[PDB]
Design a protein around this ligand. Sequence first.
Ligand SMILES: C[C@@H]1[C@@H](C(=O)O)CCCN1S(=O)(=O)c1c[nH]c2ncc(Cl)cc12
Length: 167
Amino acid sequence: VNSFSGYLKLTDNVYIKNADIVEEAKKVKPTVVVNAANVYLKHGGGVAGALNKATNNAMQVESDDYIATNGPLKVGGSCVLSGHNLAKHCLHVVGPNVNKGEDIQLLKSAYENFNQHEVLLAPLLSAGIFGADPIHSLRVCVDTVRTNVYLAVFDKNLYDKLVSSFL
Ligand SMILES: C[C@@H]1[C@@H](C(=O)O)CCCN1S(=O)(=O)c1c[nH]c2ncc(Cl)cc12
């Protein structure tokens, strides 16, 4: 038993809710919240900009030190940093950005990072401003992640379309 509430169960291990991931993180304080990161950990907009804003820019300060030490992430890669006031940890995961021409096949590699964590609160990778089809992202999620994932979808219209078209 965990504290996630109001989710629709899609599979044995994947759950979905129309929710603002920032507000959901603030309420649940999950062990892991996933950020929709880029390789530079520049949290300017989308999910990343919202999570960072909610940390009063502490996520960005920590991220800048991480990059100065380690260099950029790989597309499809991840790093674990603090969850600040939102979660114990933040798993920064880089899905491919279609608006940069990145290979969509890397979306599966991106989701594989979730398997290193027993339970996660997450957005749909490569959705939103990353330009991928969210229905496809959900399919890759279900077919790749084996750990327990609670997906927060900000847009109610998109949430209803994801549920209604889910196979
Ligand atoms: C897939 C989501 C989708 C959702 O999950 O409802 C709705 C719009 C597109 N994006 S987005 O790229 O991540 C995004 C852009 N700005 C944002 N600000 C805050 C938050 Cl929480 C998410 C975003």
